[PDB]
């Protein structure tokens, strides 16, 4: 439910609603003017009632092998086991003569039939769209210590968090947040997991979300959901050297390892009784018109604070720390700010824990405070006068470097989510919808022309396109080739 200590999180600035895209293992932190800071993340997604679409055989056996032989110029042999469904039959030809038992010399036809049996099969099932089940966690930052910030039970007992279920049947629900009010989400589970480009393939105890086209093109003997008769069985059989009376047929070895090699790139999932995975995306709209500030009339804390846990960097240009309060004043606001210098104490930066405060009235209360300082030097100041305590902090980067990092992150978000990327952190407008639509048409024209390519092929194609465009003419084909080459190289490098 909570994103503190998560290696990848997005910050959104709030105008009563904002539509977000919750990715698999990621979180979004939303700050709005005069609003509690919230964070929302898709914890997992689920599928409950799957039906088999196709079984492939990857370990098969031969049971009894028969050969029917014809003398030369007598025509085809036609082993009589071709009338039985479980027998695989192949026609060959062998040397025949007086020594063998023929009245003639030459190539005599033989027909060999071997009884096919499947020992081990991989089962592919489909997901019905109505059975998808997203788990979503929401958390109001509120007043927490470091040991209860990630504890869901504590945050639920404080009415500051909630994990709930998003279903196509019930795509929108609201969570009560105690004195913070209510927080609503309306999602699009149908537009989330595609559910029509995927199968769930179970091989042994391993389960994979796989593309439908790859699964249907698999070169193994296959059958129908309840069928016991197999097609393309000759894939798993080797007919040995023809012999006038005994051609031998050998089953190949188990193809389980070959199947695992072929599955390279499929998404592992858990299928104990229902498919669970943490790798999709879900577009939602967070509505916060009923979200209110809590403790607007507490008043500032009067005693001295101490750094219980020293300021630590979270890796997202933000700083977290934990204060301890010597006072027993009660619920009071914490006078913490970020200043440029200890003279000219005007606040700068931005609190992420908006309106930090002490929750209870007993002493030695610990409060987790998390804020975003500016680039360069700053001071975390809490208290005034003789009780004031200061902490010197330095943020390493720069504004332009951060802008470049945000640009490349947005580019790779476009590369991942495609069109839903414009839905990410938007508030509508003629810009986002037009940009989304032109992205849709260009994405169609790009997937129909360069889809189904690995990183190496698209990198080489981008190199060729850059070369030709630099050497092109008309300044209009050249721009198209330059753009396509650049996008292809970016995609090739984006998987490394």
């Amino acid at each position: 439910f909570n994103c503190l200590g998560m290696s990848n999180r997005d910050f959104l600035e709030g105008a009563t609603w904002v539509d977000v895209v919750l990715e698999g293992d990621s979180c979004i932190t939303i700050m709005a003017k005069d609003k509690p800071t919230i964070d929302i993340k898709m914890m997992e997604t689920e599928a409950t009632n799957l039906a088999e679409v196709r079984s492939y055989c990857y370990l098969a056996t031969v049971s009894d092998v028969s050969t029917v032989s014809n003398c030369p110029t007598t025509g085809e042999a036609h082993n009589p086991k071709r009338a039985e469904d479980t027998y695989v039959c192949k026609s060959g030809v062998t040397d025949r003569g007086w020594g063998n038992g023929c009245g003639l010399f030459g190539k005599g036809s033989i027909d060999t039939c071997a009884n096919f049996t499947c020992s081990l099969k991989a089962v592919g099932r489909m997901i019905q769209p109505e059975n998808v089940k997203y788990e979503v966690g929401i958390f109001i930052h509120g007043s927490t210590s470091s040991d209860t910030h990630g504890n869901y039970s504590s945050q639920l007992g404080a009415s500051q968090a909630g994990r709930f279920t998003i279903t196509p049947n019930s795509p929108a629900i609201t969570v009560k947040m105690g004195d913070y009010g209510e927080i609503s989400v309306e999602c699009e589970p149908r537009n989330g997991l595609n559910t029509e480009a995927y199968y769930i393939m179970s091989v042994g105890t391993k389960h994979f979300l796989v593309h439908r086209e790859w699964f249907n093109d698999l070169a193994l003997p296959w059958t129908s959901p309840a069928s016991s008769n197999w097609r393309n069985r000759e894939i798993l059989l080797e007919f040995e050297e023809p012999h006038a009376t005994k051609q031998s047929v050998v089953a190949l070895g188990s193809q389980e390892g070959a199947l695992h090699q072929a599955l390279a790139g499929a998404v592992p999932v858990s299928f104990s009784s229902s498919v669970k995975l943490t790798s999709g995306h879900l577009k939602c709209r967070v509505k916060m018109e009923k979200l209110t500030l809590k403790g607007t009339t507490y008043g500032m804390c009067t005693e001295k604070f101490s750094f219980a846990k020293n300021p630590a960097d979270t890796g997202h240009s933000t700083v977290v720390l934990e204060l301890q309060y010597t006072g027993s004043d009660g619920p009071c606001k914490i006078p913490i700010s970020i200043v440029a210098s200890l003279s000219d104490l005007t606040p700068i930066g931005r609190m992420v824990t908006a309106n930090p405060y002490v929750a209870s009235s007993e002493a030695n209360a610990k409060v987790l405070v998390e804020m975003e300082p500016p680039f360069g030097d700053s001071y975390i100041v809490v208290g005034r006068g003789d009780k004031q305590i200061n902490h010197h902090w330095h943020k390493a980067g720069s504004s332009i470097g951060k802008a470049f990092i945000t640009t490349i992150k947005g580019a790779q978000r476009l590369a991942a989510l495609g069109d839903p990327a414009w839905d990410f952190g938007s508030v509508g407008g003629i810009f986002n919808s037009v940009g989304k639509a032109v992205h849709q048409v260009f994405g169609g024209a790009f997937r129909t022309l360069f889809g189904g390519m690995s990183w190496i092929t698209q990198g080489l194609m981008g190199a060729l396109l850059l070369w030709m465009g630099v050497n092109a003419r008309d300044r209009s084909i050249a721009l198209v080739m330059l753009a396509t080459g650049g996008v292809l190289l970016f995609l090739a490098t984006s998987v490394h």
Partner: protein, 75 residues
């Protein structure tokens, strides 16, 4: 993997079929045909580019064939 590392034609003189000779024609071609028929739009890319960077019909066809063969391999 290892099945990608396929043993070639044996150097022994063999008036007999090798280990998997039924698939001898289809081993090197299944991936190309499957990828081509699942990605029909790449064919136009191949023809167009090969017609561009060439200078005459002699090497345009070679470019088209080479591009149509290189991309199904390496996926």
């Amino acid at each position: 993997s290892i099945a990608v590392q396929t043993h070639g034609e044996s150097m022994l003189a063999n008036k007999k079929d090798a280990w998997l000779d039924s698939t001898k024609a289809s081993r090197y071609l299944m991936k190309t045909e499957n990828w081509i028929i699942r990605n029909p739009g790449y064919a136009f890319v191949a023809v167009l580019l090969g017609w561009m960077l060439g200078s005459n019909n002699g090497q345009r066809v070679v470019f088209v064939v080479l591009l149509l063969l290189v991309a199904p391999a390496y996926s």
